[PDB]
Point group: C3
Chain length 277, copies 3
């Protein structure tokens, strides 16, 4: 049987930093000097509370704003609600999550589980346009009790005309072995719509990207249109039914793929070989 | 228990007008001199029939065309099918709705229930490009027997680079009290794709925007990409799990929010106060 | 009762050609001299294997690449994986499909069933930008055991600013009789997002476009946003609840419909008449 998420409800603490990078970009990190674009993955269980002690090490105001999770207005990360952070400053954001359940009126409250993201809200403009452009974005995953955990999680961010703020035609590339349970968090940012596509693999267009059984009528797809701040996620079995290979993923907007929005899902045999590579 | 829609099947009558407004815009209304942009909400139950006695008070041809509901070709609102209205003229459009049910061949006929809209089809071009641009659009809601009625319904229309044809950074703003059941009808028009986003709230990407219980695998989202003539809708509990606050909604295409596609969901305590506002 | 797909598992063989057309376009066909834009429909049952003996009759390199179905890397149709075809050359692509089922780890493997497409991957650019632009695309349908077969299937491809590579305002138009079970395969290609819309009809936004019964919470729609390489499909009962008529379909992006992305769903009485036509 596959590994599954346990019941949540833990209180968790975390240090996060905003850093200007030597190349001019901006990244979050869990450790000073180890910021990355995209930011590090934050993964919690429904019901967990997360207290992020955030330090802006930059010379400009910056913030943390999250999608999907519960937060009070004092943690929405906006200038308006006095929730950004001054240069050199520290603030504790609090993110909460909740489980689904029946309300008193008989309705069904949705849980927090899903594929989400965090990003800056005040660099460049009051909507973080400069922050996002420079790399201040990262993924968040909230797990429901009992759903399936992967062998590894990769984050693919279409940010304007870049993948993960990389130069055209520089990946990123990811590697797996035939049979691995691979998870993708797919996030879009900036100005343009895109269509995300994988060669040789497909997934369900629902909450987890996975069907639990035969009753789910969700479309099975390998192409999906996305816009700025959209986030979705899915799991695949690397090479399932198709074998080892250098499997392209790309934006399928023709000029975008032509201009470098391309990468490789490198699925290897156990000996490491990739047919045709 | 929450209030729910009853069984439909009523025959309803309605007067509607198209008016040029003093500012140059065009609006529909239920009363002469009270046209609005967006047009007034039309809400019916599955099975109801609606007879709209429509008068074009403008000096140009205009029409009414609806999405989703049943109508005969004589009510499709097009110049081609001789279904528009001459300046000063009156025409009765008929919209019908039906319930779901089993067909003789064993298949399942879908019902009309959903979040829909009406708009002009002949002002400026044979596709109403001028009518829509000037404000001739409005929302339609069709309820299925037994689904949940809100405390209030707000209509948010992304029309080209405007929200409800308003100037940049002029809202609209909406108000609620922590705990209200708030319904959003979200409609897109014009030339551009958008992504609709709410701070502090989320909904289900299905027909009603709501989960009935734990078996629904629909993604829970707070960001959604939309294109011209898309309509969807949802309900939220104002401030549920997040409290009172000035909660922004906006298009999340960065330049669009920077250029004014922003508004506030003002969720108040009972004393009317909004923390940080 | 309606006709339904049987269990699959047949091994099928097929000849396909790439041809330059006299007008300058490029089309696939099952017979030399009978290429079409879009390419011919390939329809199989889940579990079938398809061996396509493909001949490039053009003076440039070309390929076949499919979405959604199972294929080994040697059939992905890319220059990178040495899977394109030289001018005048022949290659056998193999497409496989599989049924859903329970994995050993308890998870649910999705089946291949869906609305898919094939297109060129090497004409003009390493992403087939020229091939797709010139007309090298076609639809694929994979049926699950037991789902509903239509009276006829039409393919509507939004390719850049054209429908099926046709000149503005030249259709295509399709015809039916009130009561026909009409299937639409809707595919998008090129550079631009679109919104596909039908007058007088609607469908479910799920895998088959159809609801099986009352438990499916999928949104019922008549407008849908699409991007390059998106494919979906649905069935409707021609004129159901609305009668005979010249029912427009179009992209609902206003300038796109104004510029000719329009066609007619001609639904006739048995005597062939169309009210208002
Ligand atoms: Cu925001
Ligand atoms: Cu792109
Ligand atoms: Cu955001
Ligand atoms: Cu129309
Ligand atoms: Cu926008
Ligand atoms: Cu319309
Ligand atoms: Cu490709
Ligand atoms: Cu279009
Ligand atoms: Cu492709």
């Amino acid at each position: 049987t596959a590994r599954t998420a346990p019941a949540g409800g833990e209180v968790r603490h975390l240090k996060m930093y905003a850093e200007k990078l030597a190349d001019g970009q901006m990244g979050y990190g869990f450790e000073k000097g180890k910021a990355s674009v995209p930011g590090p993955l934050i993964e919690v269980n429904e019901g967990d509370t997360l207290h992020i002690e955030f330090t802006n090490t930059m010379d400009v105001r910056a913030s943390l704003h999250v999608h999907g999770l519960d937060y009070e207005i004092s943690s929405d990360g906006t200038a308006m609600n006095k929730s950004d952070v001054e240069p050199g400053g520290t603030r504790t954001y609090t993110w909460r999550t909740h489980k689904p359940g029946r309300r008193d009126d008989g309705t069904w409250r949705p849980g927090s589980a899903g594929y989400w993201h965090y990003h800056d809200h005040v660099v460049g403009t009051e909507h973080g346009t400069g922050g996002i452009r420079n790399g201040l974005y990262g993924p968040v995953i909230v797990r429901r009790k009992g759903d399936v955990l992967p062998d590894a999680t990769h984050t693919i961010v279409f940010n304007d005309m870049t993948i993960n703020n990389r130069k055209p035609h520089t990946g990123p590339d990811f590697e797996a072995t035939v049979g691995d349970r691979v998870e993708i968090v797919m996030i879009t940012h900036g100005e343009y719509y895109h269509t995300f596509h994988m060669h040789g693999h497909r997934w369900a267009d629902n909450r987890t990207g996975i069907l639990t059984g035969p009753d789910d009528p969700s479309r099975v797809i390998d192409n999906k249109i996305t816009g700025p701040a959209d986030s979705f996620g899915f799991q695949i079995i690397a090479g399932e039914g198709v074998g080892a290979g250098a499997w392209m993923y790309h934006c399928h907007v023709q000029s975008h793929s032509d201009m470098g929005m391309v990468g490789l899902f490198l699925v290897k045999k156990p000996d490491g070989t990739i047919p045709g590579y």
